């Protein structure tokens, strides 16, 4: 029924967009090589380019936010919504919080259907069904324990229970997050109009569903939408705070700017809603996806958004829908999550290379700049480290910190609550543990296995140490070579005397800024 949207003429938008991407890449590369072949002014130029990109993104985000806030329209509670949740080994506390949040959603009960799928049918997963039965005791609740999946009878019972009852709980054999999502989507059928997806560690605000329905009911062109998912445990560790700041920056700058042009690249898994008809149209193709990083099968929320964009339906984003989701506090769990995210992004980049002619040019621009940024950053860092002077390394570090400080100041301006100044410490995490993680994710696209287990039997998987060790060894060798060369250089001349004083003052300022940031973080985490 939903027609596959397509622009009026191909070979006329596709060619122009591909040529624009190639021209942009060639121009950026040419400027980079020109700077490389013919120290302060080059880094300054890079800083101004990043600053201009930030101003463009922030202006578009502000315009979108003002448009959303100004525009309003009363909602007619006539569209059915189905919340689908998946649980592998979730902690009882997070699961109970999610269940209560779903139950207390400020939506009519005759237009809301809750379905939960448990990834496991053994005796160690019956507790999730027990809590589900305890929570929705007074409603039309139906529970089943399947002995298999859709790709292993019970199919008729599962479909009947899902389509004929409000609250449904189904166990199934272990098949990963893809299997539970596929089972829920297949059992949905055509019962509802909107399908909202949610993880079993996400607490939902009461007005999130209402606002998402409002933004999806304004125009028929929209096919998917996402919300502003936040962190419910931002004080568990230092990395949790950084994850919260990064989440807020993402969902309030990048998502808003993409929604201004209706090209939201990714819809958050914990908070996302899709049109039922389109979802049922592309479900089978979504499950049967491969040829990404060799021939390994894939499928996730990012692939769902990519399919929605491929069919021609634009994806929106509203800031009035709020949710809280937990994030890893351990360093290695966070690294594994980042590697999995980067693997998914790299796999989806090839699939989303096409479909660019359907939704604007900002998608292509953002995709190409995000693809080329880490490589150029790594090349610049390697060149400046291998230059062989303490001077160059010192201003390299100083420029990396000044750019981060300016970004954090602008973030404080647009946010308005001043806690955002702590984001300036994200450089020490991006340039030491995130770039090697990205390289590892690029080098091992053919592998899989999620990486992080459920929150019952927390486990190890200390694999990311190898990229970290390699990066640390490379950096240490570079700094050692530079310090050796500069110590074996000439001195006692006025130029070198002034250089020594300037670098001493720069180091003093750097350490003062570092201790100021540390004191501010300590005071804000203690008081």
């Amino acid at each position: 029924i939903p027609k596959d949207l397509e622009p009026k003429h191909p070979t006329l938008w596709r060619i122009i967009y591909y040529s624009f991407g190639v021209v942009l890449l060639a121009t950026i590369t040419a400027a980079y090589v020109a700077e490389f072949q013919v120290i302060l002014f080059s880094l300054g130029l890079y800083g101004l380019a990043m600053l201009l990109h930030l101003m463009m993104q922030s202006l578009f985000a502000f315009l979108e936010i003002r448009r959303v806030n100004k525009s309003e329209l009363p909602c007619s509670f006539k569209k059915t919504v189905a919340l689908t949740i998946a649980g592998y080994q979730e902690n009882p506390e997070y699961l109970i919080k999610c269940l209560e949040s779903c139950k207390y959603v400020k939506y009519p009960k005759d237009k809301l259907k809750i379905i939960l799928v448990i990834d496991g049918n053994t005796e160690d997963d019956a507790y999730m069904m027990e809590m589900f039965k305890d929570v929705f005791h007074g409603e039309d609740v139906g529970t089943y324990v399947w002995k298999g999946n859709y790709h292993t009878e019970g199919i008729n019972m599962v479909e009947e229970l899902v389509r004929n009852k409000r609250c449904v709980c189904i166990m199934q054999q272990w098949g990963g997050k893809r299997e539970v999502m596929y089972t829920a989507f297949q059992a949905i059928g055509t019962s509802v109009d909107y399908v909202q997806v949610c993880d079993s560690d996400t607490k939902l605000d009461e007005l999130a569903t209402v606002e998402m329905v409002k933004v999806l009911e304004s125009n028929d062109m929209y096919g998917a939408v996402g919300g502003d998912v936040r962190i419910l445990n931002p004080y568990d560790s230092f990395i949790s705070f950084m994850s919260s700041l990064r989440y807020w920056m993402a969902f309030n700058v990048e998502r808003a700017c993409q929604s201004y042009f209706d090209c939201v690249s990714c819809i958050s898994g914990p908070l996302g809603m899709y049109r039922n008809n389109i979802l049922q149209v592309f479900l089978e193709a979504w499950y049967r996806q491969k040829f990404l990083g060799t021939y390994c099968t894939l499928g996730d929320d990012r692939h769902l958004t990519n399919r929605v964009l491929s069919m021609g339906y634009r994806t929106k984003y509203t800031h009035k829908s709020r949710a809280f989701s937990e994030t890893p506090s351990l360093y290695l769990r966070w690294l594994n999550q980042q590697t999995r995210w980067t693997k998914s992004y790299f796999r989806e980049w090839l699939y989303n290379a096409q479909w660019w002619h359907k939704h604007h040019i900002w998608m292509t621009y953002e995709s190409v700049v995000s693809f080329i940024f880490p490589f150029f950053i790594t090349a610049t860092v390697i060149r400046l480290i291998y230059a062989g002077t303490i001077w160059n390394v010192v201003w390299l570090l100083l420029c990396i910190q000044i750019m981060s400080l300016f970004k954090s100041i602008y973030a404080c301006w647009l946010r308005g609550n001043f806690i955002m100044l702590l984001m300036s410490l994200y450089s020490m995490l991006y340039m030491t543990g995130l770039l090697p993680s990205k390289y590892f994710a690029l080098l091992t696209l053919n592998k899989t296995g999620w990486g992080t287990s459920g929150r019952k039997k927390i486990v190890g998987n200390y694999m990311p140490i190898l990229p970290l060790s390699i990066w640390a060894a490379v950096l240490c060798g570079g700094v050692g070579y530079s310090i050796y060369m500069d110590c074996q250089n000439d001195w006692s001349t006025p130029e070198k005397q002034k250089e020594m004083y300037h670098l001493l003052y720069g180091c003093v300022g750097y350490v003062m800024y570092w201790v100021i940031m540390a004191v501010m973080y300590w005071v804000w985490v203690k008081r």
Partner: antibody
Amino acid sequence: SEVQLVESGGGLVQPGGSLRLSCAASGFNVSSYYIHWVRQAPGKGLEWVASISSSSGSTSYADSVKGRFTISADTSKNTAYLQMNSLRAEDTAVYYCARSGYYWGPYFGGFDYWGQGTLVTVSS
Amino acid sequence: IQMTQSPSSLSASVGDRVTITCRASQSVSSAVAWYQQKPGKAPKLLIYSASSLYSGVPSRFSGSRSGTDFTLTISSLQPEDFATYYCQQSSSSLITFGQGTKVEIK
């Protein structure tokens, strides 16, 4: 527990008067399910009258019921309530109180756990 | 809006297959249910959603859908299966019931 529905309020009423019917529910919650009223005239078949859903405000009536009868519910009392005004001779039947789930798409679930019947006699 | 139970009367012996079909003006977004009512007794649900069967009833009763036609079939007519069968179309703001189709012994 066991789901039960009891209808009360039937009797003889002069034409043009007002009548009250109550449907008491046990074993479940009124707000979690739909409640419908079905008429069965003597010698005729089942005829729908009105329906309501608590905690949502949804209300429905038949063409010949609109403007005359009203249906409400009491979650605290767990009782459906039907007030009928401007009664006529054709209104005599055996009223039934039924329970059901929700409508969703093309799947309903039907009227399960039917209640008993109550007699209404509208004559002079 | 308009519902028509075609037979309106049927006379079959014990063990004979019984087929009762119902015609609806529109069934795009409305479910069809089949109930059984005995003389003087409240009706009991037999088939819901026009394909599924209620729990606890004998497996003999079967429901089928073809276009705008909805069919209820009984394989073996038990001596306790003689009653009046009602075909109902359920939808928001409009519910319509059937009539007739009383199976009687011959």
